[PDB]
């Protein structure tokens, strides 16, 4: 458990609408917001709770 | 919880058993007001099994015996007047038996169970029931005239306030803690007042003297009420279920904790209190030879003096013990234990 | 093969002869939905179309399908209708 | 019995050493003996951390709920959200078949679904938190891991031949999970279902869609 | 300390005697002399169900206008006693004139009329009306009306002691299943659960089908409990998203052991069974032994669904090499292996056939002379001398496999209702080394005697037969056996039945003063009555296990611990025994020598697997039988 497997998830890519076509309206229930990537990833992250 | 031990009592006199006679199988674990009564030197007795017998008051010999059964379930005292014996049952039936032959004069189905002692006054026989329909019966034929509804609490006590009659108004208790007064003319309501205090607040038999009523709730208040107004004049916190006596200017009673007390008629001030019999389930007291006799659940008749309230005699009479109240009349003291046997004391 | 006991396979709406009679050209979306029940499939893409299919495969008998197509304009009034009874 | 900080020191040392079991036996003394005290915060967070590093995932989740109920405002709440996400995710993993490398995609997705919801809440509520990158990557993984289960239901229905189920399931993926690889793999299933339903008007449309994104 | 119900009383009740009424209530005043567990603890909430029971009982005897006038409960002054009085009015009993159904019938008029039909003049019954209401509800559900409005309004014709029943029904809108969901199959593949369903997603709902889904899941045995929830889809009028809630459990046992002084030496052996290997639904079973004098091994793999139609496919592997006294060169040395491949398909919802082909290899050397084996070999045309042990035999045989299994068990691993029948039969392929046919019939019948399914009478029997097809006889190596944990408790494993009769012969690899049977070296010079079991060609075993509730164990063990009394009878015998030549030996021709045993059986589904604890008396043996009273198996 807690393996790095989730880093192997393939990169995401939108489906392109063909000419004269519109794809189904996307549900917002599973959207992905975007922010700065400066944070660490995987085991490099200090999973320990913040200190005082 | 612990219950008080028997007291050491040096007897000033040696009361003796004149006679005793077995009657059926007793009441045993059951609880009811089934007690014997004396009229014209004849002792009438009954038992839950259904046997009803007439006993000579002095010799103790049976004169006649009959069974009304099958669990006949007789209950609610044995009252006698005018040559008839009225006996309730925890089934609807209430029987009126001729004293001479012992055949059933008439039988009537009164609504609900007939726990209370039937009382007879000016040709009407009152019965108070577990469902509150205080009914009245003609002594002659047994047909009902009127019924009165007294509300039923969710949790009650297995006992109903037998009524008492004074100046045409029958005063009767109620399981909801409201002593009530009703005219026997047709059962018209007269007045009603709550006597309970903030659970079970059931009432028992009241008594009236010199125009002032007395009532006594299981919990809350002992009080006196004006017969003509029903207004409460004075009150005390002595709750109980057992019958209590009026004599002279004193009030003798037994509390719900079996502590025996004497109170004044006016103001309810305590004269003395006796507490040795605490938690010894005590029969209602009865006056005899200037003294009060109370039976217990351990078969002891405890005799107590009026003036100080200390014990004057203490004797075993039975192993099963006396739940039902003793009776005293015509100079003879009578009592029957839980077991089916009436004991005559002297 | 057919000899083995496959369970009966039901698919699509329970479109039947009586209710399809109530459909009238030009009728509004809500009442047609009420008449046939909700569509169990609809064209997910740009064309505003409703598809009713009544399909059954009993244990060994052949598949039977009755497909009904409904098209609507931008405001949901039935513009064209066709009812394929079999195959 | 020792005063709070000294016992906390040994507790933290054993936690650092990774002796998770005896470490948590040390941690659980503080909150029971010294509730409401000033140290309650750090002991509780370390308690969440210790349960998570242990296999006691549901107890970690219960503790995280009992924590978040108390202090909606807290400078470290984002960490508790991240730990909630992690303890939801770790319940999706397994030991024996994980070692064998068998994909667990088509099993229960409810845990993965809750993990995605919680991580999305984290990244949308605290976009500047240092854990936001891990939350974004884990959301990327969880979207695919949900769409893979949904596709694996579509696959079974195609193989049985309940074509309406296939069409509805693939439409559901195109509505919720359009961007993922699972839809790109599943569109052939919806094409096949439409053609088996003699629904050529829709089959041509699906053919156009798959052609445009081949 | 608390009060106790000292008397229950009911006024009126002229139709039925009070004792009869109080025979049914949970509240009860007195203890039968033969019972002790009848606690008299009164509780206020407990009386409500009792009063409803009285309601239903009087409604079930025709007293339509029955009502409770009032109920009074009172304490004794001492607080030690409760009396409960129920005051009722019966009235007259009424009989049903007829039932009229009105409303929206949804086109099912014939069936609804059939369900509500009644014989004329029958007494009114509350149970009857409730049954009709529920039956019409489920009938409407069967055609896809999940939520039909049903109302039963009786009309009293007091003028003639009769009642007319008015039923109003409105089916509503047919419901389609939008999205079937599974919650709790953490390990098993979602396909493994969904394959069992009969309600396909995106189709009109069906109460029968969605219930059969639960029924089949419960039969599969991979889950402790299964719950179904026809939750309505929000925002839509007629779509329901059926949800199955499940809970998985262990599905096998992992038995391992090592030899001690009770064995020939310190060596490993194992036995493994698994029904849901890695949650994919495959069934796997392996056995392995490497004893110094035996290297038996066995393996089996079965796919319950080779194709989604239900065609089951599986196979079996086994290997054996056994020596009787030593390793390098030993008496009665045998080597054997075989391959079985099985294909099975369901012929209906409950019956499934099986088919396949089996291949078996057998070799024997240094065989101990005995009547049965040499009779068989005489059948095959071999002529091995009885006086000399230095001879061997070999065989290569292929068999056609078939079988029939009927399964109506209510639950997989602790069944309480239905029965299971399993008929398996083998026939040699023409041209094979052996020419025999064998058929065996197994039957397990569960019937509950109490409605709670805690008292269950288990009727279980096994039967078997076999015979040579040509002039030959069926092979000794494959005979039936009885005794042990499976067939008959008490007796030693594979011990019941006809008993070998050795000839006097010279013993190979002999060593002086070692334990040996019937050797001229030891001076044995006559035919031999012996205690070494040999099995037989035909058998019949029966059992009646009286399953009972676990008496004094908490509910946490309710679904894991089971106990039962039992009575066993069983027999094995040879139809081909020639009794004429062996007057001085037991006549195995007659099956009249039934073995019997009895005892107590305890079953515990421990986390590591099922545990069988058995203690029994073989209260009717026959000569030559061996038994141990207490026997244990995993």
Curated annotation (Swiss-Prot), chain B:
InterPro entries, alphabetized: BamB, PQQ_b-propeller_rpt, PQQ_rpt_dom, Quinoprotein_ADH-like_sf, WD40/YVTN_repeat-like_dom_sf
PROSITE patterns: PROKAR_LIPOPROTEIN
Locations listed in the record: Cell outer membrane
One Gene Ontology term of the molecular function aspect: identical protein binding
Keywords per UniProt: Cell outer membrane, Lipoprotein, Membrane, Palmitate, Signal
PANTHER family, per the entry: CELL SURFACE PROTEIN, OUTER MEMBRANE PROTEIN ASSEMBLY FACTOR BAMB
Quaternary structure (record): Part of the Bam complex, which is composed of the outer membrane protein BamA, and four lipoproteins BamB, BamC, BamD and BamE. Monomer. Interacts directly with BamA. The Bam complex has the shape of a hat, with the BamA beta-barrel crown in the outer membrane and the periplasmic brim formed by the BamA POTRA domains and the 4 lipoproteins.
HAMAP family assigned to the protein according to its UniProt record, in alphabetical order: OM_assembly_BamB
Function (record text): Part of the outer membrane protein assembly complex (Bam), which is involved in assembly and insertion of beta-barrel proteins into the outer membrane. Nonessential member of the complex, which may orient the flexible periplasmic domain of BamA for interaction with other Bam components, chaperones and nascent outer membrane proteins. Efficient substrate folding and insertion into the outer membrane requires all 5 subunits.
Protein's recorded name: Outer membrane protein assembly factor BamB
Protein source organism: Escherichia coli (strain K12)
From Swiss-Prot, chain E:
Extracellular topological domain residue ranges: 262-263, 291-293, 324-332, 364-391, 429-436, 468-536, 574-595, 618-631
Localization in the cell: Cell outer membrane
Result after altering residue 87 to A: Lethal, protein does not accumulate
Gene Ontology CC: one annotated term: cell outer membrane
Residue intervals on the Periplasmic side: 1-252, 275-282, 304-311, 335-350, 406-418, 448-456, 547-560, 606
Disruption phenotype: Deletion is lethal. Depletion results in the accumulation of incorrectly assembled outer membrane proteins, including TolC, OmpF, OmpC and OmpA. Decreased expression leads to decreased susceptibility to contact-dependent growth inhibition (CDI), and decreased expression of outer membrane proteins (including in this study LamB) as well as up-regulation of periplasmic protease DegP.
Phenotype when changing residue 194 to E: Severely impairs cell growth, wild-type protein levels
Top-rank taxon: Bacteria
UniProt domain POTRA: residue ranges: 3-91, 94-172, 175-249
GO terms of biological process kind: cell adhesion; Gram-negative-bacterium-type cell outer membrane assembly; protein insertion into membrane
Chief localization: membrane
Variant or mutagenesis effect after changing residue 258 to C: Reduced folding of OmpT
Effect of residue 257 to P: Lethal, wild-type protein levels
Outcome of swapping residue 179 to P: Reduces cell growth, wild-type protein levels
Effect of residue 412 to C: No effect. Lethal
Family stated for the protein in its record: Belongs to the BamA family.
Function: Part of the outer membrane protein assembly complex (Bam), which is involved in assembly and insertion of beta-barrel proteins into the outer membrane. Constitutes, with BamD, the core component of the assembly machinery. Efficient substrate folding and insertion into the outer membrane requires all 5 subunits. A lateral gate may open between the first and last strands of the BamA beta-barrel that allows substrate to insert into the outer membrane; comparison of the structures of complete and nearly complete Bam complexes show there is considerable movement of all 5 proteins. (Microbial infection) Acts as a receptor for CdiA-EC93, the contact-dependent growth inhibition (CDI) effector of E.coli strain EC93; antibodies against extracellular epitopes decrease CDI. Its role in CDI is independent of the other Bam complex components. Is not the receptor for CdiA from E.coli strain 536 / UPEC, which does not have the same mode of toxicity as CdiA from strain EC93; the decreased expression of bamA101 in some experiments decreases the level of outer membrane proteins in general.
Subunit structure, as described in the record: Part of the Bam complex, which is composed of the outer membrane protein BamA, and four lipoproteins BamB, BamC, BamD and BamE. BamA interacts directly with BamB and the BamCDE subcomplex. The Bam complex has the shape of a hat, with the BamA beta-barrel crown in the outer membrane and the periplasmic brim formed by the BamA POTRA domains and the 4 lipoproteins.
Designated name of the protein: Outer membrane protein assembly factor BamA
Protein source organism: Escherichia coli (strain K12)
């Amino acid at each position: 458990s807690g393996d790095e497997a989730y880093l192997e998830a393939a990169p995401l890519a939108e489906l392109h609408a063909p000419a004269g076509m519109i794809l189904p309206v996307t549900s917002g229930d599973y959207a992905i917001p975007v922010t700065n990537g400066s944070g660490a990833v995987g085991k490099a992250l200090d999973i320990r709770p913040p200190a005082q | 919880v612990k219950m008080s031990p028997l007291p050491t009592v040096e007897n000033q006199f040696t009361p003796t058993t004149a006679w005793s006679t077995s009657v059926g199988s007793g009441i045993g674990n059951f609880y009811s007001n089934l007690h014997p009564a004396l009229a014209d030197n004849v002792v009438y007795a009954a038992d839950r099994a259904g046997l009803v017998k007439a006993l000579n008051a002095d010799d103790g010999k049976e004169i006649w015996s009959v069974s009304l059964a099958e669990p006949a379930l007789l209950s609610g005292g044995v009252t006698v007047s005018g040559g008839h014996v009225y006996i309730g049952s925890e089934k609807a039936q209430v029987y009126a038996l001729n004293t001479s032959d012992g055949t059933v004069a008439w039988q009537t189905k009164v609504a609900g169970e007939a726990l209370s002692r039937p009382v007879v006054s000016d040709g009407l026989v009152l019965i108070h029931t577990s469902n509150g329909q205080l009914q009245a019966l003609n002594e002659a034929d047994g047909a009902v005239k009127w019924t009165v509804n007294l509300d039923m609490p969710s949790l009650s006590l297995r006992g109903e306030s037998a009524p008492t009659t004074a100046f045409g108004a029958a005063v009767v208790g109620g399981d909801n803690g409201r002593v009530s007064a009703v005219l026997m003319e047709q059962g018209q309501m007269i007045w009603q007042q709550r006597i309970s205090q903030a659970l079970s607040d059931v009432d028992t038999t009241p008594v009236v003297v010199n125009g002032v009523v007395f009532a006594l709730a299981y919990n809350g208040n002992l009080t006196a009420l004006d017969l003509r107004s029903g207004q409460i004049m004075w009150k005390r916190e002595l709750g109980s279920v057992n019958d209590f006596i009026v004599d002279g200017n004193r009030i003798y009673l037994v509390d719900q904790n079996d502590r025996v007390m004497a109170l004044t008629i006016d103001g309810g001030v305590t004269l003395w209190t006796q507490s040795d019999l605490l938690h010894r389930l005590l029969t209602s007291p009865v006056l005899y030879n200037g003294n009060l006799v109370v039976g217990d659940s351990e078969g002891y008749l405890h005799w107590i003096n009026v003036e100080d309230g200390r014990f004057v005699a203490q004797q075993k009479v039975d192993s099963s013990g006396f739940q039902t109240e003793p009776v005293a009349a015509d100079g003879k003291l009578l009592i029957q234990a839980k077991d089916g046997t009436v004991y005559s004391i002297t | 093969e057919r000899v083995v006991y496959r369970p009966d396979i039901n698919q699509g709406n329970y479109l039947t002869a009586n209710d399809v009679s109530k459909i009238r050209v030009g009728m509004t979306q809500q009442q047609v939905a009420y008449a046939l029940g909700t569509p169990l499939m609809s064209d997910p893409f740009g064309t505003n179309t409703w598809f009713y299919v009544f399909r059954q495969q009993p244990g060994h008998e052949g598949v039977t399908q009755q497909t009904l197509t409904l098209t609507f304009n931008s405001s949901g009034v039935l513009t064209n209708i066709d009812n394929k009874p079999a195959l | 019995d020792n005063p709070p900080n000294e016992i906390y020191a040994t507790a933290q040392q054993k936690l650092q050493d990774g002796n998770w079991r005896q470490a948590i036996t040390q941690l659980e003394a503080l909150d029971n003996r010294y509730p409401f005290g000033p140290y309650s915060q750090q002991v509780q967070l370390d308690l969440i951390y210790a349960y998570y590093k242990n296999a006691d995932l549901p107890l970690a989740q219960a503790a995280i709920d009992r924590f978040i109920r108390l202090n909606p405002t807290h400078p470290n709440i984002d960490y508790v959200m991240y730990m909630r996400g992690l303890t939801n995710m770790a319940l999706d993993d397994s030991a024996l078949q994980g070692f064998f490398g068998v994909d667990r995609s088509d099993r229960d997705p409810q845990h993965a679904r809750a993990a995605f919801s919680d991580f999305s809440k984290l990244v949308r509520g605290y976009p500047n938190s240092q854990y936001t990158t891990d939350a974004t990557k884990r959301l990327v993984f969880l979207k695919d891991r949900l769409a893979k289960y949904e596709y694996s239901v579509a696959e079974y229905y195609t193989e049985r031949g309940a074509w309406v189920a296939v069409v509805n399931r693939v439409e559901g993926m195109l509505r919720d999970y359009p961007d993922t690889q699972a839809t790109r793999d599943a569109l052939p299933l919806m094409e096949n279902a439409y053609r088996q339903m003699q629904m050529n008007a829709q089959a041509e449309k699906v053919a156009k869609i798959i052609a445009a994104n081949s | 300390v608390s009060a106790e119900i000292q008397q229950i009383n009911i006024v009126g009740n002229h139709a039925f005697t009070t004792d009869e009424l109080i025979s049914h209530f949970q509240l009860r005043d007195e203890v039968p002399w033969w019972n002790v567990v009848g606690d008299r603890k009164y509780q206020k909430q407990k009386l409500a169900g009792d009063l409803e029971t009285l309601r239903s009982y009087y409604l079930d005897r025709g007293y339509a206008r029955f009502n409770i006038d009032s109920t009074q409960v009172s304490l004794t002054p001492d607080k030690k006693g409760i009396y409960v009085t129920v005051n009722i009015t019966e009235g007259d009993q009424y009989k049903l004139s007829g039932v009229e159904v009105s409303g929206n019938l949804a086109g099912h008029s014939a069936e609804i009329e059939q369900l509500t039909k009644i014989e004329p003049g029958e007494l009114y019954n509350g149970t009857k009306v409730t049954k009709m209401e529920d039956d019409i509800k489920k009938l409407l559900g069967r055609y896809g009306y999940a939520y039909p409005r049903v109302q039963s309004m009786p009309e009293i014709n007091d003028a003639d002691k009769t009642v007319k029943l008015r039923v109003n029904v409105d089916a509503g809108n047919r419901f389609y299943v939008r999205k079937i969901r599974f919650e709790g199959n953490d390990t098993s593949k979602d396909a493994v659960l969904r394959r069992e369903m009969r309600q396909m997603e995106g189709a009109w709902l069906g109460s029968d089908l969605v219930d059969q889904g639960k029924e089949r899941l419960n039969r599969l045995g991979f889950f402790e409990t299964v719950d179904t929830d026809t939750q309505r889809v929000p925002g839509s009028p007629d779509q329901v998203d059926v949800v199955y809630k499940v809970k998985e459990r262990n599905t096998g046992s992992f038995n391992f052991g090592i030899g001690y002084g009770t064995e020939s030496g310190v060596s490993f052996q194992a036995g493994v069974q698994q029904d849901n290997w890695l949650g994919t639904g495959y069934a796997v079973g392996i056995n392995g032994t490497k004893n110094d004098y035996q290297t038996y091994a066995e393996l089996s793999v079965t796919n319950p669904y080779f194709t989604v139609d239900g065609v089951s496919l599986g196979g079996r592997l086994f290997y054996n090499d056994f020596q009787a006294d030593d390793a390098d060169l030993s008496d009665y040395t045998n080597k054997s292996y075989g391959t079985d491949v099985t294909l099975g398909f369901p012929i209906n919802e409950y019956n499934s056939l099986r088919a396949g082909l089996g291949y078996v290899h057998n070799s024997l050397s240094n065989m101990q002379p005995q009547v049965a084996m040499w009779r068989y070999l005489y059948s095959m045309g071999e002529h091995p001398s009885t006086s000399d042990q230095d001879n061997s035999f070999k065989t290569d045989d292929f068999t056609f496999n078939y079988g029939w299994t009927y399964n109506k068990l209510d639950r997989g691993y602790f069944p309480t209702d239905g029965s299971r029948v399993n008929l398996t039969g083998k026939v040699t392929i023409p041209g094979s080394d052996n020419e025999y046919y064998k058929v065996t019939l197994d039957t397990a019948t569960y019937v509950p005697i109490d409605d709670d399914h805690k008292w269950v009478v288990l009727g279980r029997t096994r039967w078997g037969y076999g015979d040579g097809l040509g002039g030959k006889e069926m092979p000794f190596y494959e005979n039936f056996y009885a005794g042990g944990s499976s067939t008959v408790r008490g007796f030693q494993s594979n011990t019941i039945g006809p008993k070998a009769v050795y000839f006097p012969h010279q013993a190979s690899n002999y060593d002086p003063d070692y334990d040996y049977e019937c050797a001229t070296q030891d001076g044995a010079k006559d035919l031999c009555k012996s205690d070494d079991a040999v099995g037989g060609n035909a058998m019949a075993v029966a059992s009646l296990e009286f399953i009972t509730p676990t008496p004094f164990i908490s509910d946490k063990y309710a679904n894991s611990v089971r106990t039962s009394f039992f009575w066993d009878m069983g027999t094995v015998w040879d139809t081909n025994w020639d009794s004429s030549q062996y007057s001085g030996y037991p006549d195995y021709s007659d099956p009249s020598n039934i073995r019997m045993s009895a005892g107590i059986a305890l079953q515990w589904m421990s986390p590591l697997g099922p545990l069988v604890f058995s203690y029994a008396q073989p209260f009717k043996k026959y000569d030559g039988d061996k038994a141990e009273q207490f026997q244990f198996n995993i």
